[PDB]
Amino acid sequence: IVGGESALPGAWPWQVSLHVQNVHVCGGSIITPEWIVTAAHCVEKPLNNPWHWTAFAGILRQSFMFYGAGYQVEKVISHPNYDSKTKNNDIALMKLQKPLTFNDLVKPVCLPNPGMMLQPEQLCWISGWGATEEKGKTSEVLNAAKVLLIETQRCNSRYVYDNLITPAMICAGFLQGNVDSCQGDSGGPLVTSKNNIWWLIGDTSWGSGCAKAYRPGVYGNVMVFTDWIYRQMRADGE
Amino acid sequence: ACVRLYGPNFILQVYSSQRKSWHPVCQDDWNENYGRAACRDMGYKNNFYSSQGIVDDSTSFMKLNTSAGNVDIYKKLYHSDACSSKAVVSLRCIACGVNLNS
Ligand SMILES: *[C@@H]1O[C@H](CO[C@@H]2O[C@@H](C)[C@@H](O)[C@@H](O)[C@@H]2O)[C@@H](O[C@@H]2O[C@H](CO)[C@@H](O[C@@H]3O[C@H](CO)[C@@H](O)[C@H](O)[C@H]3NC(C)=O)[C@H](O)[C@H]2NC(C)=O)[C@H](O)[C@H]1NC(C)=O
Ligand SMILES: *C(=O)c1ccc(NC(=N)N)cc1
Numbered sequence: 001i002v003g004g005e006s007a008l009p010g011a012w013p014w015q016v017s018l019h020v021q022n023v024h025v026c027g028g029s030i031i032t033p034e035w036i037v038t039a040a041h042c043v044e045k046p047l048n049n050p051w052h053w054t055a056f057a058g059i060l061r062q063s064f065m066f067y068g069a070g071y072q073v074e075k076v077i078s079h080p081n082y083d084s085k086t087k088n089n090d091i092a093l094m095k096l097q098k099p100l101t102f103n104d105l106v107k108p109v110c111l112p113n114p115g116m117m118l119q120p121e122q123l124c125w126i127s128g129w130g131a132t133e134e135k136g137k138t139s140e141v142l143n144a145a146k147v148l149l150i151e152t153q154r155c156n157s158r159y160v161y162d163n164l165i166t167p168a169m170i171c172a173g174f175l176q177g178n179v180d181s182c183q184g185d186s187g188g189p190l191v192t193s194k195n196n197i198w199w200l201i202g203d204t205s206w207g208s209g210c211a212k213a214y215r216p217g218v219y220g221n222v223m224v225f226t227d228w229i230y231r232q233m234r235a236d237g238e
Numbered sequence: 239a240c241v242r243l244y245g246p247n248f249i250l251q252v253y254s255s256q257r258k259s260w261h262p263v264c265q266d267d268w269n270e271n272y273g274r275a276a277c278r279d280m281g282y283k284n285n286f287y288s289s290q291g292i293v294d295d296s297t298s299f300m301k302l303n304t305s306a307g308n309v310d311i312y313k314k315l316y317h318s319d320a321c322s323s324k325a326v327v328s329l330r331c332i333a334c335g336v337n338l339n340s
């Protein structure tokens with residue numbers, strides 16, 4: 001996260017850190033004790049297999065995520081229509097081998113319903129352990145920032161992303177830059193508060209550079225994937 | 239089963255291909271056990287949080303057929319212009335969406 005602030009304990013209790021080879025690679029969001037939403041790009045081959053992955057919940061600092069205390073991932077499911085070239089349909093699910101214990105520091109975010117009626121520039125939050133500057137190292141501390149949704153028509157303008165923003169994508173941030181997601185935050189949440197509920201609007205996906213002007217963050221449009229999520233969760237074990 | 243929870247108040251709705259329209263479920267004869275069955279159909283396994291009637295902010299409703307057999311909950315609904323209870327189903331499958339400041 002560029003231009004954010006250290007997260008407080010229990011502010012973002014759905015945020016997980018997803019590790020491979022004992023280091024943070026990606027973020028994700030808890031939706032049930034066993035299911036995490038993340039980005040398909042995170043789990044491209046050669047990291048498609050669950051064995052690579054552990055999840056850390058309820059812990060703000062990377063140095064307190066101890067080898068052996070993560071939750072092992074049992075299943076990885078990438079969206080069937082994910083396209084690595086365009087990053088279209090950039091969403092994946094991870095299922096944990098053992099369910100998480102919810103408490104004040106670990107709890108789920110709500111999946112977005114059709115008909116949320118968000119404002120065109122709805123105030124949202126992003127969180128993660130991404131770099132705090134373009135080309136930076138992983139953040140030791142979980143950060144968060146306020147971002148606004150950017151209307152798709154604006155984001156698709158010639159001076160921004162010039163027709164690259166599909167219906168499965170939403171833009172957020174600031175066209176002046178300075179506050180944005182960055183490498184390491186991908187897979188993590190874009191959330192908003194409505195009706196006293198926090199909703200998972202997006203999963204951090206891509207953008208050109210980080211925190212550059214006219215190059216905002218692009219997020220998977222979780223609304224369009226909810227029915228796929230339901231169907232995957234229902235199929236599991238059946 | 240083409241079904242959704244709609245809006246920030248979780249209105250349970252069923253799609254009609256004939257009408258190209260979504261319809262809320264009448265609270266008539268509904269209960270938390272139907273709530274639980276609907277949640278299972280949406281893939282929530284043994285998660286359930288609440289099922290309550292609310293006022294609907296749509297004319298046509300889906301109504302529960304109490305005289306149906308043991309079929310899937312969505313095969314137990316039919317089209318009705320009328321909802322005697324004047325309320326529709328609001329269904330939450332999991333306690334979610336709360337944090338430090340809630
Ligand atoms: C509530 O359900 C009643 C029970 O029906 C059963 O369960 C439902 C969920 C569905 O699976 C039904 O197919 C199933 O039978 C409904 O009563 C049934 O209504 C159907 C007509 O829709 C009727 O079917 C006829 O059966 C005769 C007997 O063999 C057959 O010869 C005819 O071809 C069928 N009629 C038609 C219209 O062609 C069936 O017999 C009924 N079953 C019983 C036990 O009476 C009931 O209609 C429904 N309530 C509402 C408001 O729709
Ligand atoms: C994922 O790690 C990710 C997402 C988005 C960006 N760039 C911008 N938000 N501009 C980088 C990395």
Ligand SMILES: [Ca+2]
Pocket residue numbers: 045046047048049
């Ligand atoms: Ca492989």
